[PDB]
Amino acid sequence: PGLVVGLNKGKTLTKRQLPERPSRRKGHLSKRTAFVRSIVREVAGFAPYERRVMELIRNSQDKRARKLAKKRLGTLKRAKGKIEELTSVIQSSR
Amino acid sequence: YVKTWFNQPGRKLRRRQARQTKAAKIAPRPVEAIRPAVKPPTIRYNMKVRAGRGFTLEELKAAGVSRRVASTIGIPVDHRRRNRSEESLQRNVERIKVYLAHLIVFPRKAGQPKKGDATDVSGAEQTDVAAVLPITQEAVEEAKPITEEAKNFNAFSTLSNERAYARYAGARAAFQKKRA
Amino acid sequence: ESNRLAAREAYKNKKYIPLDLRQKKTRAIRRALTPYEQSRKTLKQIKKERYFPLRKYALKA
Amino acid sequence: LEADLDSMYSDYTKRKAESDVKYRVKKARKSKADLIDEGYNRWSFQSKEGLPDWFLDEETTVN
Amino acid sequence: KWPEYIRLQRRRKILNLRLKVPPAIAQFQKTLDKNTATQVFKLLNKYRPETAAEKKQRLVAEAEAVANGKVSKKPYNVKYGLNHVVALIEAKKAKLVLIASDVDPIELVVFLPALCKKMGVPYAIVKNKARLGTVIHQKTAAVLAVTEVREEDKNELASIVSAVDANFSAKYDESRRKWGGG
Amino acid sequence: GAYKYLEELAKKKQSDVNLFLSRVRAWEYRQMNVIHRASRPSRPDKARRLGYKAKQGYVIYRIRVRRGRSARCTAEERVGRYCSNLRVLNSYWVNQDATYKFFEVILVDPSHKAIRRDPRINWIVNPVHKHRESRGLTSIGKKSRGIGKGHRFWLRHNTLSLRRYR
RNA sequence: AUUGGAUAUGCCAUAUAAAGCGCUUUCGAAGAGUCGAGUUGUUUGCAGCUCUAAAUGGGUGGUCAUCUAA
RNA sequence: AUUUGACCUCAAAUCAGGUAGGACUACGCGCUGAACUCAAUAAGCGCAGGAAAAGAAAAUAACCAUGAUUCCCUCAGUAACGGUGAAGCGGGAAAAGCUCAAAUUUGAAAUCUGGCAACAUUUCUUUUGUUGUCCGAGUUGUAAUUUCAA
């Protein structure tokens, strides 16, 4: 509204669409690096605590599985990031 | 530990000689580069205009000069700054345009003005940028006639409403999401 | 002197000469980088200085 | 060769028993199932079954 | 008592044959058989890369030809270099892959058997990096790849690929999932 | 390029293959000396991305230091003192055990002509880079002294500036 | 007697090349015992140790904004 | 049998050519560190230069947005902590940007140190190079192209 106070506070000008900055991209999953990550995955295996999570999930005790995963990593977002990845591996193995 | 300033006139003289030596060394070109017009990033100083570090890639491309040759002819380039409004865009664009219009480029190898150069270059003279490109301030509004709908418009009554809307924005934000 | 000029003639145009015949400015200058290898540049920088060198310009007042 | 290494290490221990003693290095629900869970780490897979003594000695004293 | 360097030389060998080896490493000490290996190197002897002297002779010959009065045939040679071979596997341009069995850092070759199997590329593990080095006129070659040959050599190239299949894939095909060593 | 595979494998340090290799290698370095030459780096991908080229002038030394200050910084300082004609380029962790952490340090010979004629490494020959590992100008050195960019990262206070006119 | 940089002038070079700019019918690789968490120590920052990551992910500031570490 | 040749590892040489030490320390960067906030001080230890360090955002901000580092005035004795004590913004001094790893040159290692022989050039018979030839390094990756601004 061209106003100093409000949810759209500030001046009103003609807004310009900024060109895409390449450093914003990092974190993207290229097909080639995804393929290489697949190869190392099938050639290296999984860490010992991953194997315990497989056993925990195959036993269907998900609460303890996420609790110990958070204890191993340190953050809930990392624990969730693990869980979806190893369950995703689970149906692939099945 | 004390820091005394008995070398203040000495420092001032040394800086002036360094400027003088710089001018003598690179006399054909101005001793200060072109700088873009840039607005300070705060509510206390957003009403002013000062000299930024350098132009952006979008401004350089819109003006028609490439980012590679821009450094060579003396146009500093900032790769971090971005233009979020056309008002700043054509503002810096017209700064470059007037710079280029007043700019003369000596041909290299002194054989012919290959594409972008100057045919006659005997009129060389060292002049500061500020004279040709005097950075200005925000345009001060001149007198305008009385607006009738603005006259009916109260003023801070609105600022009270959008304020109350802002403070209790989460209050109704909850209200809709919980009832929906 | 006659011996040293004779030795310099003997070792003229050789890669290695006696440390007495070699120069002695300072140990730091001897260990420093020579101007040739300070001026060495990658082909990338050679192309950059070939195509976009510091131009010669001026402003009309 | 393997017998030679075993004999050499056995001789090494025999001499070290007297000559190189000098060790003395100071000169001024959560349950057993969870215990198994953290019981698997980088050292739990370092299986030592059937390892020779000339390797087990340093593995125990260092690792 | 033997010097410490040769003691460690023998001790590293005994431990490598003593410890429990994961299958990704256990697949390496099982290699190609003798006669197949000789036929492999007999084929590669034909397609060894040209030496520096031969390259220089060719370069000066074409240079003087262009200068005086004036484009050559398609080169045929074995492809070496770890990155170049890996690129060929990625592009599926390679027809046969040979990996030295005794690379010092084993991670440089541990991923290859999985990668060739993923691309369906015939791969084999041959004895000693030195032999591959003499093939490509080098001291050390960690991997060799055959991607193209002449028409008359295509027939026996298919035959040796079948032979290595029989002696490396039809035979074994279990050490990559068997806990080796121990 | 295989270095992508080498890098991705180095990520998973708890893998069975990595665990077996680390134990065997760490055992091997044990009866090796505390500081010993390594003719070829054990992690070529790490060495290349840290600045090591396979040309005459680059030197790789392996050092073991006991655990229990920064071990990486201490490793660089000891190797730099042990090879006094070399400039410490960088260093990287290779292995660890219960008590010994193993590091590989990349060094450059400033006196070698293959280094003095290379414009991409010529900066290290200048005398301002003598004993960077001791002055705290390496990667781990900078991180240990807290050099960074941001609000997170003395003499301006202990002085009382007295101007001419006041 | 040296030089530092330019101007005029002469001779070699070899461009069958290299580079900038507008489009994509395209893909866009980006740093690991590192980040991070718990604990002890030093004046958020750093270090020791247990444990140990991810790839529109990670860091920072109050879903958004800004950066792209090792 | 065993002889011959490779590669790997490790040695030895008064081998060929180089390099490190020690001194100064006012300023600079680290480690360490008391006592009567003292003080991240003094002492002790390591390491450089003509400056050193820092430096081209894993930065501020919440703006119409700023845009590498360093220094000065101001912010300000404010925020913050329990006497200690900033920083953003703003005005100036000075300004300059970049380089790698991560992708095949695969129709060609195109790369580089050293030995030998000439040609040179010099603050200089004392300096620095060029070409040719040989050996070596190097495919466990040297060259060219790419560094996210892309």
Q: Give the Cα separation of F21 and D45 in Å (integer).
A: 13
Q: Provide, in whole angstroms, the distance separating residue C13's CA from nucleotide H130's C1'.
A: 14
Task: Count CB neighbours of F99 within 10 A.
Answer: 13
Tokens matching residue A87: 């369950």
Tokens matching residue D52: 């020779």
- 3-class state of residue B51 by DSSP: strand
Q: Give the Cα separation of B138 and B37 in Å (integer).
A: 10
Tokens matching residue A92: 């692939």
- For residue E107, list chain F residues with Cβ-Cβ distance below 8 A: 6, 9-10, 17, 21
Technique used to solve these coordinates = cryo-EM
Chains E and C touch, contact meaning at least 3 pairs of CB atoms under 8 angstroms apart: no
Instruction: Report which residue type is found at B40.
Output: P
- For residue D37, list chain A residues with Cβ-Cβ distance below 8 A: 49, 52, 56, 68
Rounded to a whole number, what is the distance in angstroms from the first to the last CA of chain E?
Answer: 28
The residue among F41, F12, F9 whose CA lies nearest residue F25 is F41
E39, F34, F52, F111, F122 from F117: Cα distances, Å: 46, 33, 16, 11, 7
Alpha helix ranges (H) inside chain F: 3-11, 16-31, 44-50, 71-82, 113-116, 132-135, 139-145
Task: Count CB neighbours of B155 within 10 A.
Answer: 8
Strand H nucleotides below 7 A of a protein CB?
5-11, 17-21, 28-32, 40-41, 46-69, 71-73, 77, 85-87, 89-110, 112-116, 119-121, 123-129, 133-134, 136-146, 148-150
Pairing of strands E20-21, E180-181: antiparallel
Tokens matching residue B33: 């580069």
- For residue B121, list chain C residues with Cβ-Cβ distance below 8 A: 58
Nucleotide with minimal C1' distance from the CA of B64 is G21
Q: Report the Cα A11 to chain-centroid distance in Å.
A: 38
Task: Count CB neighbours of B28 within 10 A.
Answer: 15
Those of residues 7-36 in B touching chain F at CB distance below 8 A are 8
Contact D42 F19 (CB under 8 A): yes
- For residue A64, list chain D residues with Cβ-Cβ distance below 8 A: 34
- For residue C55, list chain B residues with Cβ-Cβ distance below 8 A: 69, 72-74, 105-106, 108
Q: Provide, in whole angstroms, the distance separating residue B84's CA from nucleotide G10's C1'.
A: 57
Write down the residue that tokens 């791969």 correspond to.
Answer: E123
Contact A42 E114 (CB under 8 A): yes
Write down the residue that tokens 């009129």 correspond to.
Answer: B123
Nucleotide with minimal C1' distance from the CA of E3 is H10
State residue E74 phi and psi, 5-degree precision.
-70, 120
- Residues F43, F94: contact at Cβ < 8 Å? yes
- Residues D63, F30: contact at Cβ < 8 Å? no
Task: Count CB neighbours of B8 within 10 A.
Answer: 12
- 3-class state of residue F69 by DSSP: coil
Task: Count CB neighbours of B7 within 10 A.
Answer: 11
Handedness of CA F78, F82, F87, F88 (dihedral sign): negative
State residue A20 phi and psi, 5-degree precision.
-70, 130
CATH code given to domain F2-145:
3.40.1120.10
- Most distant CA pair in chain C, distance: 68
The residue among F139, F1, C23 whose CA lies nearest residue E87 is F1
Q: Give the Cα separation of F77 and F105 in Å (integer).
A: 10
Tokens matching residue A89: 């591996």
Pairing of strands E123-126, E96-100: parallel
- Residues E129, E142: contact at Cβ < 8 Å? yes
Q: Which residue is nearest to nucleotide H77 (CA to C1')?
A: F157
Does E118 lie at the interface with A, CB-CB under 8 angstroms?
Answer: yes
The residue among E86, E124, E143, A29 whose CA lies nearest residue F5 is E86
| Non-local CB neighbours of F140 within 8 Å, separated by 6+ positions | F70, F72, F73, F76, F91
Q: Exposed, middle or buried, B2 (CB in 10 Å: 0-12/13-18/19+)?
A: exposed
Q: Give the Cα separation of F11 and F46 in Å (integer).
A: 11
Q: Give the Cα separation of E108 and E121 in Å (integer).
A: 18
Pairing of strands F160-162, B2-4: parallel
- 3-class state of residue C37 by DSSP: helix
Q: How many CA atoms lie within 13 A of E155 on its CB side?
A: 1
Q: Provide, in whole angstroms, the distance separating residue F143's CA from nucleotide H147's C1'.
A: 23
Strand G nucleotides below 7 A of a protein CB?
7-8, 16, 18-22, 27-37, 44-58, 60, 67-68, 70
Which one-letter DSSP state was computed for residue C32?
S
- Residues F103, F72: contact at Cβ < 8 Å? yes
Which one-letter DSSP state was computed for residue E97?
E
Q: Which helix (H) or strand (E) holds A66?
A: helix A62-73
Ordered DSSP codes for B77-124 = B-SS----BHHHHHHHHHHHHHHHHHEEEEPGGGS---SSS-S--TT-
Neighbours of chain C (3+ CB pairs under 8 A): B, F
| Non-local CB neighbours of B120 within 8 Å, separated by 6+ positions | none
Contact F162 B3 (CB under 8 A): yes
Q: Which helix (H) or strand (E) holds E180?
A: strand E180-181
Q: Give the Cα separation of F78 and F85 in Å (integer).
A: 13
Q: Residue F37 forms beta bridges with which residues?
A: F61
Which one-letter DSSP state was computed for residue B74?
T
Does E91 lie at the interface with A, CB-CB under 8 angstroms?
Answer: no
Q: Residue B103 forms beta bridges with which residues?
A: C59
Q: Exposed, middle or buried, C11 (CB in 10 Å: 0-12/13-18/19+)?
A: middle
Q: Give the Cα separation of E38 and E22 in Å (integer).
A: 29
Tokens matching residue F115: 């280094």
Contact F97 D55 (CB under 8 A): no
Q: Give the Cα separation of E169 and E161 in Å (integer).
A: 11
Task: Count CB neighbours of F5 within 10 A.
Answer: 24
Q: Which residue is nearest to nucleotide H40 (CA to C1')?
A: F154
Chains B and C touch, contact meaning at least 3 pairs of CB atoms under 8 angstroms apart: yes
- For residue E11, list chain D residues with Cβ-Cβ distance below 8 A: 5, 54-55
- 3-class state of residue C58 by DSSP: strand
Pairing of strands E143-146, E96-100: antiparallel
Ordered DSSP codes for E17-85 = TTSEE-HHHHTTSS---HHHHHHHHHHHHHTPPPPHHHHHHHHHHHHHHHHH----PPP---EESHHHH
Q: Exposed, middle or buried, C39 (CB in 10 Å: 0-12/13-18/19+)?
A: exposed
Q: Domain boundaries in chain F?
A: 2-145
Of F158, F161, F164, the CB nearest to B6: F164
The residue among F34, F26, F30 whose CA lies nearest residue F79 is F34
| Non-local CB neighbours of C53 within 8 Å, separated by 6+ positions | B72, B108
- 3-class state of residue F53 by DSSP: coil
Rounded to a whole number, what is the distance in angstroms from the first to the last CA of chain F?
Answer: 68
| Non-local CB neighbours of E100 within 8 Å, separated by 6+ positions | E109, E125, E126, E128, E129, E132, E141, E142, E143
Q: Give the Cα separation of E109 and E102 in Å (integer).
A: 9
The residue among F162, D30, D43, B28 whose CA lies nearest residue C54 is B28
Task: Count CB neighbours of A81 within 10 A.
Answer: 13
Q: Residue F103 forms beta bridges with which residues?
A: F63, F93
Does D50 lie at the interface with E, CB-CB under 8 angstroms?
Answer: yes
Tokens matching residue E56: 């220089």
- Residues E92, E119: contact at Cβ < 8 Å? yes
Rg (CA), chain F: 19
Q: Give the Cα separation of F38 and F32 in Å (integer).
A: 11
Chains B and F touch, contact meaning at least 3 pairs of CB atoms under 8 angstroms apart: yes
Tokens matching residue C16: 């290695």
| Non-local CB neighbours of D41 within 8 Å, separated by 6+ positions | A48, A49
| Non-local CB neighbours of B44 within 8 Å, separated by 6+ positions | none
A39, B8, B76, B130 from F92: Cα distances, Å: 25, 49, 39, 52
Does D46 lie at the interface with A, CB-CB under 8 angstroms?
Answer: no
Q: Which residue is nearest to nucleotide H146 (CA to C1')?
A: C44
Task: Count CB neighbours of D58 within 10 A.
Answer: 12
Q: Give the Cα separation of E55 and E74 in Å (integer).
A: 14
Q: Give the Cα separation of B180 and B159 in Å (integer).
A: 29
Write down the residue that tokens 């490598």 correspond to.
Answer: E16
The residue among B96, B53, B101, B98 whose CA lies nearest residue B77 is B53
Tokens matching residue A76: 């809930």
* Chain C interface test: which of F117, F123, F124 (most C C-beta within 10 Å): F117
Measured torsion, CA atoms of residues A60, A64, A67, A73, in degrees rounded to the nearest 10:
-70
User: Buried b / exposed e across B39-75, counting CB within 10 Å, b at 16+?
Assistant: beeeeeeeeebeebebbbbbbbebbebeeeebbbbbb
Ordered DSSP codes for A6-48 = STT-S----B-PPPPPGGG-TT---HHHHHHHHHHHHHH---H
- For residue C15, list chain F residues with Cβ-Cβ distance below 8 A: none
Q: How far is F16 from chain A (nearest CA, A)?
A: 7
User: Buried b / exposed e across E88-126, counting CB within 10 Å, b at 16+?
Assistant: bbeeeebbbbbbbbebebbbbbbbbbbbbeeeebbbbbb
- 3-class state of residue F160 by DSSP: strand
Tokens matching residue F124: 């290290």
Q: Give the Cα separation of E130 and E124 in Å (integer).
A: 16
Which one-letter DSSP state was computed for residue B147?
P
Neighbours of chain E (3+ CB pairs under 8 A): A, D, F
Q: Provide, in whole angstroms, the distance separating residue E10's CA from nucleotide H11's C1'.
A: 17
The residue among D37, D4, B153, E42 whose CA lies nearest residue A3 is B153
Q: Exposed, middle or buried, B93 (CB in 10 Å: 0-12/13-18/19+)?
A: buried
Ordered DSSP codes for D3-62 = HHHHHHHHHHHHHHTTTT----------SHHHHHHTT-STTTT---TT--HHHHHHHHHT
